[PDB]
């Protein structure tokens, strides 16, 4: 009982203190953000 | 209303809406990160 409850408390502390454990999901937002921005910025290019 | 707006710098489509944004007295046109004009100052009067 003290092993599981303290372990869940470690998950709450590791998730609150470290925000980079979810970076796997933040990469998805970054890949979409770079893709949406690149497509619209090419409209200003002269394309020859 | 959605109308064609040209003040000296561009010809495009959009809706003019008053907001609380503040621009420098020496600034005229502005754009977002997508390189599209979201604001134009009135040539004759002072408006944003």
């Amino acid at each position: 009982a003290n092993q599981f409850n303290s372990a869940i408390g470690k998950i709450q502390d590791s998730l609150s203190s470290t925000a980079s454990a979810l970076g796997k999901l933040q990469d998805v937002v970054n890949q979409n953000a770079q893709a949406l921005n690149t497509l619209v910025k090419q409209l200003s290019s002269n394309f020859g | 209303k959605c109308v064609n707006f040209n003040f000296n710098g561009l010809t495009g489509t959009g809706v003019l809406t008053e907001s609380n944004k503040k621009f420098l007295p020496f600034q005229q046109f502005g754009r977002d990160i997508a390189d599209t004009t979201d604001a134009v100052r009135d040539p004759q009067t002072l408006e944003i």
């Binding site: 933040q26 953000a33 949406l36 497509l39 619209v40 409209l43 | 977002d32 997508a34 599209t36 979201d38």
Partner: peptide, 28 residues
């Protein structure tokens, strides 16, 4: 972590998800 409306001005439409955050939590 708007950027959605900024893309919609150039003709890029962001579609809303099928499952809302409330339904996903009800799945969990």
């Amino acid at each position: 972590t708007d950027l959605i409306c900024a893309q919609k001005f150039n003709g890029l439409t962001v579609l809303p998800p099928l499952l809302t955050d409330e339904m996903i939590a009800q799945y969990t």
